[PDB]
Ligand binder design. Structure first.
Ligand SMILES: CCCCCCCCCCO[C@@H]1O[C@H](CO)[C@@H](O[C@H]2O[C@H](CO)[C@@H](O)[C@H](O)[C@H]2O)[C@H](O)[C@H]1O
Ligand SMILES: CCCCCCCCCCO[C@@H]1O[C@H](CO)[C@@H](O[C@H]2O[C@H](CO)[C@@H](O)[C@H](O)[C@H]2O)[C@H](O)[C@H]1O
Ligand SMILES: CCCCCCCCCCO[C@@H]1O[C@H](CO)[C@@H](O[C@H]2O[C@H](CO)[C@@H](O)[C@H](O)[C@H]2O)[C@H](O)[C@H]1O
Ligand SMILES: [Br-]
Ligand SMILES: [Br-]
Ligand code: NA
Lengths: 125, 96, 125, 96
């Protein structure tokens, strides 16, 4: 029950952020909507740092780990929007940006996780 | 707030029995365009055909010489809020 | 913007709680490509793809329900961060074959479930 | 409900100064195993080194012939709930 509040409090902030970020920005470059991208990189950044930090503090309350990863990162990022955008571009005959959207999101959100992880790995050393 | 409607719809080439229409795409992911045409004198049926979202021109053929036609073009587009939807039309009158 | 905010939170928490519950039950059952996170992304891919084609036929739906389904439920039910850590974890563990498989199955499987949801409903109507 | 601790840890090949330890990997994604070993008797400094997760074996060297050693092995693994965390250890004795 206390864990369901971590997911709901953490996931509400993330869903709200992804919403405010996705409407205020997505329409500016329809070939690769940038609101659905920043939340995914920013959530990839946060999960990467969450990865390295939670390792060095094994005694953290699972409430705060749940709020940041399953809640915040989970709500903030989104596969659905990334699909319809790519599905929209495939149905529009825009194969080059469908492939680029896929390539950028995946290569990018991994690079943003490796960045968050090693920045904390390196700061602790 | 980004307009989903095309702009500058115009007949760029004409014979008595065909029109080459063109337009300028909107600032949105456009999946396909619908071109609609028919006799302006509301005494004739309307026809519609899709063109891919990559094309910004279309040929209307089989027309009657010396007749006034209404030509309209609207989009089926992906936005973030509305997902798939149909935009309002841009319309021109043109006599062959 | 206050009513619109509730649609995101309600649908999102339902989406999030959903993703939380499913992920802790099934994720451990096959760690090379966790099935929990894979289902909520195929499911949301399905739900957004059907929402893609049903919203198209009902152009007068309250933006409250479209917001609660797409941005909220589909937005919260799905995640990109957990698919990034699981790929970054397979990479730091040298399971390169499965890291690549996880990228393909999520990207391709979620587009299929979006096309499935779209054309199943396009064909009904 | 899936244990992160390795199982069936045994010295499989031995010489006077080295031990080849092997283990069964847990059904979790393991990033690296941590091998530790010290002289069972009392207060010798326990030494430890990491082994990549793809490997499930490890060689320990620089030991004195005729000494009882305590070789423990645990994991740095990824589970969905804890992200990166450490496992409880599995341990053996072996006298060279
Ligand atoms: C990596 C795999 C992911 C999963 C699979 C996703 C598949 C998504 C696209 C399916 O939808 C079709 O795409 C065609 C190509 O875009 C469109 O052709 C339309 O546009 C073409 C443009 O060349 C025209 O030639 C066609 O006549 C016209 O129907 C067609 O309408 C549309 O229904
Ligand atoms: C195309 C998208 C790219 C996005 C960015 C991807 C970044 C990936 C980072 C992976 O992190 C490294 O992975 C190595 C390989 O797994 C590990 O080597 C470890 O594991 C190897 C294989 O088991 C051993 O040979 C090494 O000695 C050992 O240090 C290493 O520790 C770890 O930090
Ligand atoms: C697009 C960019 C792609 C490349 C990204 C970087 C991949 C290579 C990393 C090289 O640096 C590594 O740093 C690790 C520490 O972070 C070391 O891990 C050592 O310590 C780790 C724990 O900190 C263990 O898990 C490892 O097995 C052990 O080799 C490892 O020796 C060292 O080489
Ligand atoms: Br997550
Ligand atoms: Br979404
Ligand atoms: Na989400």
């Amino acid at each position: 029950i206390k864990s369901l509040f971590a997911v709901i409090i953490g996931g509400s902030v993330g869903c709200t952020l992804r919403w405010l970020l996705s409407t205020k920005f997505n329409s500016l470059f329809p070939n690769l909507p940038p609101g659905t991208l920043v939340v995914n990189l920013l959530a990839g950044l946060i999960i990467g740092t969450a990865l390295a930090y939670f390792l060095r503090q094994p005694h953290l309350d699972p409430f705060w780990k749940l709020m940041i990863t399953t809640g915040l990162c989970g709500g903030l990022s989104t596969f659905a929007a990334f699909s319809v955008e790519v599905f929209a571009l495939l149905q529009a005959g825009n194969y080059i940006w469908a492939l680029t959207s896929v390539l950028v999101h995946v290569i990018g959100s991994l690079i943003m996780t490796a960045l968050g992880f090693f920045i904390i790995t390196i700061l602790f050393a | 707030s980004v307009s989903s409607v095309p702009t500058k719809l115009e007949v760029v080439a004409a014979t008595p029995t065909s029109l080459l229409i063109s337009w300028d795409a909107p600032a949105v992911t456009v999946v396909h365009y619908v071109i609609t045409y028919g006799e302006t004198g509301g005494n004739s049926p309307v026809q519609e055909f899709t063109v891919p979202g990559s094309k910004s021109t279309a040929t209307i053929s089989g027309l009657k010489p010396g007749v006034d036609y209404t030509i309209t073009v609207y989009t089926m587009y992906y936005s973030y809020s509305d997902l798939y939807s149909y935009s309002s039309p841009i319309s021109i009158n043109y006599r062959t």
